[PDB]
Amino acid sequence: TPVTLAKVIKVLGRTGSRGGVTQVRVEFLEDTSRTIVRNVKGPVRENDILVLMESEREARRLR
Amino acid sequence: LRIRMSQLEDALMVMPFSYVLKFLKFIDTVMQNKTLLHSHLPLICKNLFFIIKFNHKELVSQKNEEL
Amino acid sequence: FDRTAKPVPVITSEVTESLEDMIRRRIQDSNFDDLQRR
Amino acid sequence: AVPSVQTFGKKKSATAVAHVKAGKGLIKVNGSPITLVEPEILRFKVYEPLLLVGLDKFSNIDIRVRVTGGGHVSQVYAIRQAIAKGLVAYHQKYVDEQSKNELKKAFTSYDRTLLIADSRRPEPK
Amino acid sequence: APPVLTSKDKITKRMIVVLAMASLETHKISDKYVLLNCDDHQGLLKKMGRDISEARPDITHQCLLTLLDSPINKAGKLQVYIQTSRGILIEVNPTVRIPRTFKRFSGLMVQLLHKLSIRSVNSEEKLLKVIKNPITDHLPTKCRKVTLSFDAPVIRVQDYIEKLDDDESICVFVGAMARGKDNFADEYVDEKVGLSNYPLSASVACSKFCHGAEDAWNI
Amino acid sequence: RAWDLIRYRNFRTFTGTERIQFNCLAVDPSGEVVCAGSLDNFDIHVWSVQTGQLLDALSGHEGPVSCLSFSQENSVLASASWDKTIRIWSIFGRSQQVEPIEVYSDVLALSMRPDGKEVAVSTLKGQISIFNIEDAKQVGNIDCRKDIISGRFNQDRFTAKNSERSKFFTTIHYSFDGMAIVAGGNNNSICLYDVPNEVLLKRFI
Amino acid sequence: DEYAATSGIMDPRIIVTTSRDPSTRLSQFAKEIKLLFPNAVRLNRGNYVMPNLVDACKKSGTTDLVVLHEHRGVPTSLTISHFPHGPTAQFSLHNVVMRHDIINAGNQSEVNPHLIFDNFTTALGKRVVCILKHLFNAGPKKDSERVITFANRGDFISVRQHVYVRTREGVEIAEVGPRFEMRLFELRLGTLENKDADVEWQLRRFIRTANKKDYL
Amino acid sequence: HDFAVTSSTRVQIFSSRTRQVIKTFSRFKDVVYSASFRSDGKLLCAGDATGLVSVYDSYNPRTILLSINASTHPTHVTKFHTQDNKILATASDDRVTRLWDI
Amino acid sequence: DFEVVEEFTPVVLATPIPEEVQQAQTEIKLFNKWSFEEVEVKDASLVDYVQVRQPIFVAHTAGRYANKRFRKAQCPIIERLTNSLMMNGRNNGKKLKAVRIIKHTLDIINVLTDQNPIQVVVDAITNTGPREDTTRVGGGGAARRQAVDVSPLRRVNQAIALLTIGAREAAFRNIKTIAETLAEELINAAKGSSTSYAIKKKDELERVAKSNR
Amino acid sequence: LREKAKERNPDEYYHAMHSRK
Amino acid sequence: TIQDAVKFIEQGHVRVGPNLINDPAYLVTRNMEDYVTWVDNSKIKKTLLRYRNQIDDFDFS
RNA sequence: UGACGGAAGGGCACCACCAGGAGUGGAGCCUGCGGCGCGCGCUACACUGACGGAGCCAGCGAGUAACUCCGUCGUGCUGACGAGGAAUUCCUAGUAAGCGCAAGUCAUCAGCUUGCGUUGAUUACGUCCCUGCCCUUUGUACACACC
């Protein structure tokens, strides 16, 4: 599949997350408009770019 | 109203841009009603201005004449 | 023969219950000794 | 009399003294040549002060380095620190101070652990 | 002799069978142990409170005897993994002459449990042993996981194995419980399928999957 | 002590606990914490400013802290002390993480860039270093010693050349693009340098 | 003399650390000492030289250091140090049994404890009660519910820790944590670094009155 | 300036100066047939009667790079590509020859 | 045309230096054999998370890359690999042995497939780093998981760990040493040939992430 | 002697440190 | 001796903290009895370091 | 400042999450604890080899090794074992761990204890979602701002 690549623009705070995962507002690179709130697992900084299998589902809380 | 002042700034930072969009739709249907608009005006203003200040980069790249 | 020093007291049920009723009396009366602020 | 300069260099417990003077270009560690330095895989860790900046800066000086203490990797870090700051101090004193801060720029751009050891540790969290 | 294997090699084309809920609980009266059987006590099982019908090492025993007489065990593409519901991953290497009755098997099991090993008659390989959890530690990496299903549709296991090649191993979780829900290993199994409309028994179900693997590999 | 500059009045006064003289201060750009450093306590005192109580005292040096600063964007603090040592504290966010950086001589006059990405320190040997703070890596340094004319006094019995009263700087500052350090000392020269090319570009008397 | 300056003003902080290449049972016991005190932190001792450890701790501004020594898993000694050139007592341990051996009843309480000292009578008793109570969190509440008991029993400080709760008909108990028979054997006015400071007091094992008297 | 001969269960390598064995390898288990340098002249191939053809670096005999099996027939000849540095031709008595890629 | 003459007497110093060393003074190569330039991270999203822009001589820089958070993503990738390669209970501390065995490893990587082994190991990392996984969320203590995405630091770290422990486990009881086993593992990972341990575990983990997505 | 050593005060200057070495 | 001390600090060799001291009338505080050290390139500092042969010359003194 | 709860907000933790590391539990010998059971140490079981040479680096102390190189062999075993299972414990930088080396300091310890040197990593350095524990619920402090 064509896979997409997206720049983190904000790490979310205060979300009630599973330990380890962190919700994150990431924004795409082939375009520059559409942002989407995924959730990552490892340590994540502001403006690292991460590879996304999907482009149509943002996640939510885990618990 | 019932969410607090402290965690509000991330409570309406969690939500995606589609939820920002329907929040704008709510702001239309709440300022078409001057009964409760005037009794929640600084709250509505602070929420709306922080929402579009944080979402400004996607807002000005949206292309919707009705928006 | 004779010995240098008194060895370790082997802790018995009666001595631990004696210090237990000691601490019962003390913490009932709240007459303990802690530090205070300034 | 003859122009000389003595510098030090310390890893964990190894200590390296460097006598750098005006000479013909010989670099000796305890009388051994610089090529015959064990453990043979960090010979380039020893080489990089005289390799980063080119041997033409080493053509007129000769260096003798004593080393004591420590294990193998501590000794080779002590050797390279002593070589580096001996060359820097020789150029600070006897020749071009412009060449001095050229050399200092080169070594600090590569790694400043080749000029200043990181002494004051640990941390009580 | 074909290459008889253990978890030392985890690449070749293989039919892994893992038997779920072969419960091994030994209470030693004093004398000697008793197992979890319906017919070794009526007392100690109702002292430990669980019901009567869930006592089953005999059915997993006849399952592993069906496998140890099945021709793939003599071919060399089987590596038998059972696990107690309490987590005791027991592996069987195919160099074994298994006890051919219930009593010698159930007496061998406490030797296995209390030595964590048992040796062969020449003692140059360890032929039956309990080894490390998780089960993925000893099953291969690209191992497609299935289990016995009752409430799931039916496929053709012949081409279901024939679509893959020798660069892959296929594992089946045989649920040898009494009754209930087959969610014991739904952490691991990612595709759930049985081979008839109504529920099987465990031995004929795993023999169905073994003859499907045999018609796939033509054995 | 704080000062409002609209009502033109004091409104807060933070003290220590024992009346020690303070020597340098910094303040979080989000004005929530105020940090001060002394000559005789080796610590950095942190006060909350919205409530006047002493927040904490954070340590790690063993000489007096000469200069302080707060990074204007990521709010990490950079202190510089006569242990020949600059030290980076991340205070906020559950961590309180310190990180030391050694330098050659003892330090005066820290000043960090408006990007909050690197730090200029003015050491006592007549040199001024620049450290990127995401790493501990030194970007470069300016030898600022042989270009500051130090006046011989009326009463001193040494030349102006061998004098070492002021052959160093004691306060530096960046420009607001982060491109030029102005520096001044206990001598009659105020110089300014540009940090990419690392060269003097003017010296005022 | 070094505690009226900072008695109840600053709450202490304590670093608890093991001897050198410690056992797993010793590290469990050091964790238990960290859970016994408030505001203490167990620090891994490995390749830490004792001088650079002790002055790195004193430049980090901690108040007390508690090292521990062992013998084949059984802990045998501890050492209380006070840092602004304060005194070090050092004690041995005799009947030490731990909750990690006995019962895994969940977590401990960590509340600001109360302190009980039974018949510390002499001047050495006052010095050791000062060195023992100035490592606890200053000024606990009234309804704080864990207490520590330090009973002198013929120079054998029996140490236990209890969680009490008052009924109306009395007060009932639940001990938890460590259990010590410690005894003092040295005390010097320097830190742990020197082994050069003046011995304030150490017990005399070999006089001909080594067993008659108490607080020798 | 060096050359190899294919002795039985060893390959012997000689110089142009001393005219005797300067290096050799003798941990083959069967009689070996083919010894062949690659065109760069760094490693060397050797095919045996077992049919597990072994390539290993020359000027260092005690290391074995990779011993890959051909067909179970004795690999009679094995030589590298004349210009390519990564493809190796083998031939045993399987009535088929193979262009392996190392 | 144009010239620049800096040296005016050739290098003839009294301790006669090796000629390959005084040839290496013109440009730094790893191990005096492999030039760090013309080596690119073919992927994006791992550029500036695998350090290759700063050339070294051997893989034994003694910097401090564990005190801050992300600054272990700036020490170069070769010694990142050898520090993960030293990790096992039998052979801790022996990083000189680790350095020399990855020296032999990437040397035979070059003599098999000759482009340069640092490019081989860089795109081996980019092909082995997993792009999604799951997390075992509670869900009432059921068999419950949810697919998430992986930050590139975790991607690089897990790729290095997978490659090193795959080389160890494939060289446990075989004739091959850990050197040539890591060599063939890195070559298969560079091609992405679905044969090596790390690429197999990567595709398995992304498979279960896609399944439980 | 150990006490003098650890209280050396390394600014110890005299005039005899051109005959002593 | 104190006469030699006035000789040294009238020749300008010492400093307290950063700043050099030229006049002997500067009495010190309780704080600054610790940073009384010579300046660097003070050749008395150089001669005592070369007496102990800890003369490092990278730090210019 | 009577007691008992509830709700809200916030902090902290390797007796929490998360990611890993290293052990224990398998064998033999031992000290200690309990009434044979337990656990700590030491020695094994390993083409990370065995050899025969070569090489060179350690700091603590003064009471008349490792590793490296060169050539050679070349790995299913002990007359009870193929790396330790179930699970559990502990752990965040000169840290885990490997390697030695001294000394024997009034209590403790020689089966060892304590120091000292060497070599030296992987993974977090976030989060209160789970397990908990704690604090607050006048913000009361002197502007601005929020509540």
Side-chain angles (χ1 to χ4, degrees), chain D residues 12-13 69-71 73-75 123:
Chain D
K12 296 177 167 43
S13 78
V73 296
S74 314
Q75 260 168 17
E123 60 91 15

mmCIF file of all heavy atoms in Angstrom, chain D residues 12-13 69-71 73-75 123, chain L residues 57-59 66 93-94 117-120:
data_model
loop_
_atom_site.group_PDB
_atom_site.id
_atom_site.type_symbol
_atom_site.label_atom_id
_atom_site.label_comp_id
_atom_site.label_asym_id
_atom_site.label_seq_id
_atom_site.Cartn_x
_atom_site.Cartn_y
_atom_site.Cartn_z
ATOM 1 N N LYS D 12 39.472 7.874 34.185
ATOM 2 C CA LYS D 12 39.013 7.464 35.515
ATOM 3 C C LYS D 12 40.079 7.422 36.603
ATOM 4 O O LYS D 12 39.966 8.098 37.627
ATOM 5 C CB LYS D 12 38.371 6.085 35.396
ATOM 6 C CG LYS D 12 37.136 6.042 34.535
ATOM 7 C CD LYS D 12 36.634 4.619 34.422
ATOM 8 C CE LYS D 12 35.252 4.580 33.842
ATOM 9 N NZ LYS D 12 35.164 5.521 32.703
ATOM 10 N N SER D 13 41.135 6.652 36.384
ATOM 11 C CA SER D 13 42.297 6.738 37.255
ATOM 12 C C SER D 13 43.605 6.778 36.500
ATOM 13 O O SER D 13 44.642 6.985 37.130
ATOM 14 C CB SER D 13 42.337 5.567 38.234
ATOM 15 O OG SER D 13 42.816 4.410 37.582
ATOM 16 N N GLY D 69 48.590 4.042 35.625
ATOM 17 C CA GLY D 69 47.286 3.751 36.175
ATOM 18 C C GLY D 69 46.249 3.371 35.134
ATOM 19 O O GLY D 69 46.464 3.451 33.927
ATOM 20 N N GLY D 70 45.100 2.927 35.634
ATOM 21 C CA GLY D 70 43.956 2.644 34.797
ATOM 22 C C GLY D 70 44.102 1.409 33.939
ATOM 23 O O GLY D 70 45.160 0.784 33.903
ATOM 24 N N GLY D 71 43.038 1.044 33.249
ATOM 25 C CA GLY D 71 43.082 -0.055 32.312
ATOM 26 C C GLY D 71 43.384 0.436 30.914
ATOM 27 O O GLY D 71 43.914 1.531 30.704
ATOM 28 N N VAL D 73 41.338 1.089 28.076
ATOM 29 C CA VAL D 73 40.597 2.156 27.423
ATOM 30 C C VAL D 73 40.799 3.472 28.161
ATOM 31 O O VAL D 73 40.841 4.544 27.538
ATOM 32 C CB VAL D 73 39.115 1.769 27.301
ATOM 33 C CG1 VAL D 73 38.984 0.580 26.418
ATOM 34 C CG2 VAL D 73 38.536 1.422 28.617
ATOM 35 N N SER D 74 41.004 3.412 29.475
ATOM 36 C CA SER D 74 41.308 4.616 30.229
ATOM 37 C C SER D 74 42.670 5.156 29.851
ATOM 38 O O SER D 74 42.851 6.374 29.738
ATOM 39 C CB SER D 74 41.240 4.323 31.718
ATOM 40 O OG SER D 74 40.079 3.579 32.010
ATOM 41 N N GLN D 75 43.622 4.265 29.592
ATOM 42 C CA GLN D 75 44.932 4.731 29.179
ATOM 43 C C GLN D 75 44.891 5.351 27.797
ATOM 44 O O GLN D 75 45.567 6.352 27.557
ATOM 45 C CB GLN D 75 45.936 3.596 29.222
ATOM 46 C CG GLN D 75 46.779 3.625 30.450
ATOM 47 C CD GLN D 75 47.539 2.358 30.617
ATOM 48 O OE1 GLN D 75 47.674 1.585 29.679
ATOM 49 N NE2 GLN D 75 48.029 2.117 31.821
ATOM 50 N N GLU D 123 25.261 11.697 40.724
ATOM 51 C CA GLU D 123 24.076 12.435 41.112
ATOM 52 C C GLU D 123 23.303 11.681 42.190
ATOM 53 O O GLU D 123 23.041 10.474 42.046
ATOM 54 C CB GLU D 123 23.195 12.729 39.880
ATOM 55 C CG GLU D 123 22.661 11.543 39.083
ATOM 56 C CD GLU D 123 21.314 11.077 39.585
ATOM 57 O OE1 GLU D 123 20.682 11.831 40.339
ATOM 58 O OE2 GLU D 123 20.876 9.974 39.220
ATOM 59 P P C L 57 52.623 -2.458 30.710
ATOM 60 O OP1 C L 57 53.634 -1.372 30.701
ATOM 61 O OP2 C L 57 52.901 -3.720 31.443
ATOM 62 O "O5'" C L 57 51.256 -1.869 31.265
ATOM 63 C "C5'" C L 57 50.334 -1.256 30.380
ATOM 64 C "C4'" C L 57 48.967 -1.155 30.996
ATOM 65 O "O4'" C L 57 48.144 -2.296 30.640
ATOM 66 C "C3'" C L 57 48.923 -1.154 32.507
ATOM 67 O "O3'" C L 57 49.344 0.064 33.080
ATOM 68 C "C2'" C L 57 47.470 -1.505 32.778
ATOM 69 O "O2'" C L 57 46.643 -0.375 32.549
ATOM 70 C "C1'" C L 57 47.198 -2.527 31.667
ATOM 71 N N1 C L 57 47.303 -3.924 32.157
ATOM 72 C C2 C L 57 46.200 -4.483 32.805
ATOM 73 O O2 C L 57 45.162 -3.824 32.944
ATOM 74 N N3 C L 57 46.276 -5.745 33.273
ATOM 75 C C4 C L 57 47.390 -6.452 33.124
ATOM 76 N N4 C L 57 47.407 -7.695 33.604
ATOM 77 C C5 C L 57 48.531 -5.916 32.474
ATOM 78 C C6 C L 57 48.441 -4.665 32.013
ATOM 79 P P A L 58 49.932 0.062 34.570
ATOM 80 O OP1 A L 58 50.843 1.225 34.719
ATOM 81 O OP2 A L 58 50.436 -1.303 34.856
ATOM 82 O "O5'" A L 58 48.641 0.298 35.471
ATOM 83 C "C5'" A L 58 48.440 -0.423 36.674
ATOM 84 C "C4'" A L 58 46.976 -0.487 37.018
ATOM 85 O "O4'" A L 58 46.400 -1.695 36.478
ATOM 86 C "C3'" A L 58 46.639 -0.532 38.496
ATOM 87 O "O3'" A L 58 46.569 0.770 39.042
ATOM 88 C "C2'" A L 58 45.284 -1.236 38.533
ATOM 89 O "O2'" A L 58 44.241 -0.287 38.389
ATOM 90 C "C1'" A L 58 45.315 -2.106 37.272
ATOM 91 N N9 A L 58 45.396 -3.561 37.523
ATOM 92 C C8 A L 58 46.411 -4.409 37.159
ATOM 93 N N7 A L 58 46.209 -5.663 37.474
ATOM 94 C C5 A L 58 44.964 -5.645 38.072
ATOM 95 C C6 A L 58 44.179 -6.665 38.626
ATOM 96 N N6 A L 58 44.565 -7.941 38.661
ATOM 97 N N1 A L 58 42.979 -6.328 39.144
ATOM 98 C C2 A L 58 42.601 -5.045 39.110
ATOM 99 N N3 A L 58 43.254 -3.997 38.613
ATOM 100 C C4 A L 58 44.442 -4.365 38.103
ATOM 101 P P G L 59 47.815 1.427 39.806
ATOM 102 O OP1 G L 59 48.432 2.456 38.940
ATOM 103 O OP2 G L 59 48.661 0.330 40.334
ATOM 104 O "O5'" G L 59 47.133 2.200 41.018
ATOM 105 C "C5'" G L 59 45.922 2.921 40.839
ATOM 106 C "C4'" G L 59 44.955 2.614 41.951
ATOM 107 O "O4'" G L 59 44.399 1.298 41.734
ATOM 108 C "C3'" G L 59 45.585 2.563 43.332
ATOM 109 O "O3'" G L 59 45.543 3.835 43.957
ATOM 110 C "C2'" G L 59 44.783 1.495 44.068
ATOM 111 O "O2'" G L 59 43.625 2.062 44.656
ATOM 112 C "C1'" G L 59 44.345 0.574 42.935
ATOM 113 N N9 G L 59 45.186 -0.624 42.754
ATOM 114 C C8 G L 59 46.410 -0.698 42.149
ATOM 115 N N7 G L 59 46.891 -1.907 42.080
ATOM 116 C C5 G L 59 45.909 -2.688 42.660
ATOM 117 C C6 G L 59 45.857 -4.084 42.874
ATOM 118 O O6 G L 59 46.691 -4.949 42.591
ATOM 119 N N1 G L 59 44.676 -4.451 43.497
ATOM 120 C C2 G L 59 43.681 -3.585 43.858
ATOM 121 N N2 G L 59 42.616 -4.114 44.449
ATOM 122 N N3 G L 59 43.714 -2.285 43.666
ATOM 123 C C4 G L 59 44.851 -1.910 43.067
ATOM 124 P P A L 66 42.440 -14.982 32.716
ATOM 125 O OP1 A L 66 41.537 -16.150 32.587
ATOM 126 O OP2 A L 66 43.786 -15.019 32.094
ATOM 127 O "O5'" A L 66 41.649 -13.723 32.143
ATOM 128 C "C5'" A L 66 40.233 -13.636 32.243
ATOM 129 C "C4'" A L 66 39.758 -12.215 32.058
ATOM 130 O "O4'" A L 66 40.726 -11.316 32.657
ATOM 131 C "C3'" A L 66 39.637 -11.731 30.621
ATOM 132 O "O3'" A L 66 38.402 -12.085 30.013
ATOM 133 C "C2'" A L 66 39.838 -10.226 30.753
ATOM 134 O "O2'" A L 66 38.645 -9.596 31.193
ATOM 135 C "C1'" A L 66 40.862 -10.151 31.878
ATOM 136 N N9 A L 66 42.258 -10.074 31.400
ATOM 137 C C8 A L 66 43.235 -11.025 31.568
ATOM 138 N N7 A L 66 44.399 -10.696 31.065
ATOM 139 C C5 A L 66 44.185 -9.430 30.539
ATOM 140 C C6 A L 66 45.029 -8.519 29.866
ATOM 141 N N6 A L 66 46.315 -8.753 29.590
ATOM 142 N N1 A L 66 44.499 -7.340 29.472
ATOM 143 C C2 A L 66 43.209 -7.091 29.740
ATOM 144 N N3 A L 66 42.321 -7.864 30.365
ATOM 145 C C4 A L 66 42.872 -9.032 30.745
ATOM 146 P P A L 93 20.102 6.565 37.607
ATOM 147 O OP1 A L 93 20.265 6.498 39.073
ATOM 148 O OP2 A L 93 19.237 7.595 36.993
ATOM 149 O "O5'" A L 93 21.553 6.670 36.979
ATOM 150 C "C5'" A L 93 22.689 6.441 37.796
ATOM 151 C "C4'" A L 93 23.980 6.514 37.025
ATOM 152 O "O4'" A L 93 23.987 5.502 35.986
ATOM 153 C "C3'" A L 93 24.271 7.839 36.332
ATOM 154 O "O3'" A L 93 25.667 8.090 36.397
ATOM 155 C "C2'" A L 93 23.901 7.553 34.885
ATOM 156 O "O2'" A L 93 24.568 8.363 33.945
ATOM 157 C "C1'" A L 93 24.319 6.100 34.756
ATOM 158 N N9 A L 93 23.639 5.369 33.694
ATOM 159 C C8 A L 93 22.339 4.953 33.642
ATOM 160 N N7 A L 93 22.042 4.304 32.547
ATOM 161 C C5 A L 93 23.231 4.303 31.847
ATOM 162 C C6 A L 93 23.588 3.784 30.607
ATOM 163 N N6 A L 93 22.733 3.137 29.823
ATOM 164 N N1 A L 93 24.859 3.957 30.194
ATOM 165 C C2 A L 93 25.718 4.608 30.983
ATOM 166 N N3 A L 93 25.495 5.142 32.174
ATOM 167 C C4 A L 93 24.225 4.946 32.544
ATOM 168 P P G L 94 26.262 9.023 37.550
ATOM 169 O OP1 G L 94 25.204 9.204 38.569
ATOM 170 O OP2 G L 94 26.889 10.192 36.898
ATOM 171 O "O5'" G L 94 27.434 8.157 38.184
ATOM 172 C "C5'" G L 94 28.553 7.768 37.398
ATOM 173 C "C4'" G L 94 28.392 6.366 36.881
ATOM 174 O "O4'" G L 94 28.925 6.276 35.540
ATOM 175 C "C3'" G L 94 29.090 5.279 37.680
ATOM 176 O "O3'" G L 94 28.322 4.095 37.558
ATOM 177 C "C2'" G L 94 30.378 5.084 36.905
ATOM 178 O "O2'" G L 94 30.984 3.828 37.093
ATOM 179 C "C1'" G L 94 29.870 5.236 35.488
ATOM 180 N N9 G L 94 30.871 5.600 34.503
ATOM 181 C C8 G L 94 31.854 6.542 34.555
ATOM 182 N N7 G L 94 32.534 6.587 33.447
ATOM 183 C C5 G L 94 31.945 5.630 32.639
ATOM 184 C C6 G L 94 32.239 5.220 31.327
ATOM 185 O O6 G L 94 33.123 5.636 30.577
ATOM 186 N N1 G L 94 31.384 4.219 30.905
ATOM 187 C C2 G L 94 30.374 3.685 31.650
ATOM 188 N N2 G L 94 29.656 2.726 31.063
ATOM 189 N N3 G L 94 30.086 4.054 32.872
ATOM 190 C C4 G L 94 30.913 5.022 33.282
ATOM 191 P P G L 117 38.680 3.126 43.427
ATOM 192 O OP1 G L 117 38.996 4.548 43.175
ATOM 193 O OP2 G L 117 37.281 2.685 43.604
ATOM 194 O "O5'" G L 117 39.273 2.270 42.229
ATOM 195 C "C5'" G L 117 40.628 2.418 41.854
ATOM 196 C "C4'" G L 117 41.108 1.249 41.042
ATOM 197 O "O4'" G L 117 40.907 0.014 41.764
ATOM 198 C "C3'" G L 117 40.405 1.012 39.729
ATOM 199 O "O3'" G L 117 40.861 1.882 38.713
ATOM 200 C "C2'" G L 117 40.737 -0.442 39.457
ATOM 201 O "O2'" G L 117 42.055 -0.551 38.960
ATOM 202 C "C1'" G L 117 40.709 -1.037 40.856
ATOM 203 N N9 G L 117 39.425 -1.693 41.138
ATOM 204 C C8 G L 117 38.454 -1.285 42.000
ATOM 205 N N7 G L 117 37.429 -2.087 42.029
ATOM 206 C C5 G L 117 37.750 -3.083 41.131
ATOM 207 C C6 G L 117 37.020 -4.214 40.719
ATOM 208 O O6 G L 117 35.914 -4.592 41.094
ATOM 209 N N1 G L 117 37.698 -4.963 39.778
ATOM 210 C C2 G L 117 38.924 -4.642 39.285
ATOM 211 N N2 G L 117 39.428 -5.486 38.385
ATOM 212 N N3 G L 117 39.617 -3.592 39.655
ATOM 213 C C4 G L 117 38.974 -2.854 40.572
ATOM 214 P P U L 118 39.892 2.312 37.513
ATOM 215 O OP1 U L 118 40.622 3.276 36.671
ATOM 216 O OP2 U L 118 38.570 2.665 38.067
ATOM 217 O "O5'" U L 118 39.749 0.995 36.641
ATOM 218 C "C5'" U L 118 40.870 0.477 35.954
ATOM 219 C "C4'" U L 118 40.591 -0.901 35.434
ATOM 220 O "O4'" U L 118 40.145 -1.765 36.502
ATOM 221 C "C3'" U L 118 39.480 -0.982 34.425
ATOM 222 O "O3'" U L 118 39.920 -0.607 33.148
ATOM 223 C "C2'" U L 118 39.074 -2.434 34.505
ATOM 224 O "O2'" U L 118 40.015 -3.233 33.816
ATOM 225 C "C1'" U L 118 39.237 -2.712 35.993
ATOM 226 N N1 U L 118 37.976 -2.620 36.759
ATOM 227 C C2 U L 118 36.966 -3.547 36.608
ATOM 228 O O2 U L 118 36.976 -4.479 35.828
ATOM 229 N N3 U L 118 35.874 -3.349 37.404
ATOM 230 C C4 U L 118 35.691 -2.354 38.324
ATOM 231 O O4 U L 118 34.652 -2.308 38.970
ATOM 232 C C5 U L 118 36.773 -1.449 38.427
ATOM 233 C C6 U L 118 37.847 -1.621 37.669
ATOM 234 P P U L 119 39.137 0.533 32.361
ATOM 235 O OP1 U L 119 40.112 1.143 31.436
ATOM 236 O OP2 U L 119 38.458 1.400 33.343
ATOM 237 O "O5'" U L 119 38.040 -0.279 31.556
ATOM 238 C "C5'" U L 119 38.400 -1.486 30.918
ATOM 239 C "C4'" U L 119 37.208 -2.361 30.666
ATOM 240 O "O4'" U L 119 36.881 -3.140 31.846
ATOM 241 C "C3'" U L 119 35.908 -1.667 30.349
ATOM 242 O "O3'" U L 119 35.840 -1.127 29.048
ATOM 243 C "C2'" U L 119 34.914 -2.780 30.588
ATOM 244 O "O2'" U L 119 34.970 -3.714 29.528
ATOM 245 C "C1'" U L 119 35.502 -3.443 31.829
ATOM 246 N N1 U L 119 34.848 -2.939 33.056
ATOM 247 C C2 U L 119 33.592 -3.417 33.338
ATOM 248 O O2 U L 119 33.001 -4.244 32.683
ATOM 249 N N3 U L 119 32.995 -2.927 34.451
ATOM 250 C C4 U L 119 33.520 -2.009 35.308
ATOM 251 O O4 U L 119 32.858 -1.662 36.280
ATOM 252 C C5 U L 119 34.812 -1.539 34.957
ATOM 253 C C6 U L 119 35.420 -2.012 33.873
ATOM 254 P P G L 120 35.049 0.246 28.809
ATOM 255 O OP1 G L 120 35.118 0.576 27.373
ATOM 256 O OP2 G L 120 35.475 1.224 29.822
ATOM 257 O "O5'" G L 120 33.547 -0.093 29.186
ATOM 258 C "C5'" G L 120 32.762 -0.920 28.351
ATOM 259 C "C4'" G L 120 31.467 -1.285 29.017
ATOM 260 O "O4'" G L 120 31.710 -1.806 30.344
ATOM 261 C "C3'" G L 120 30.519 -0.137 29.253
ATOM 262 O "O3'" G L 120 29.819 0.225 28.086
ATOM 263 C "C2'" G L 120 29.635 -0.676 30.357
ATOM 264 O "O2'" G L 120 28.713 -1.610 29.836
ATOM 265 C "C1'" G L 120 30.650 -1.441 31.198
ATOM 266 N N9 G L 120 31.181 -0.604 32.284
ATOM 267 C C8 G L 120 32.414 -0.026 32.381
ATOM 268 N N7 G L 120 32.573 0.667 33.471
ATOM 269 C C5 G L 120 31.371 0.536 34.124
ATOM 270 C C6 G L 120 30.942 1.060 35.353
ATOM 271 O O6 G L 120 31.562 1.769 36.134
ATOM 272 N N1 G L 120 29.651 0.686 35.657
ATOM 273 C C2 G L 120 28.866 -0.097 34.864
ATOM 274 N N2 G L 120 27.637 -0.358 35.314
ATOM 275 N N3 G L 120 29.253 -0.595 33.714
ATOM 276 C C4 G L 120 30.507 -0.238 33.409
#
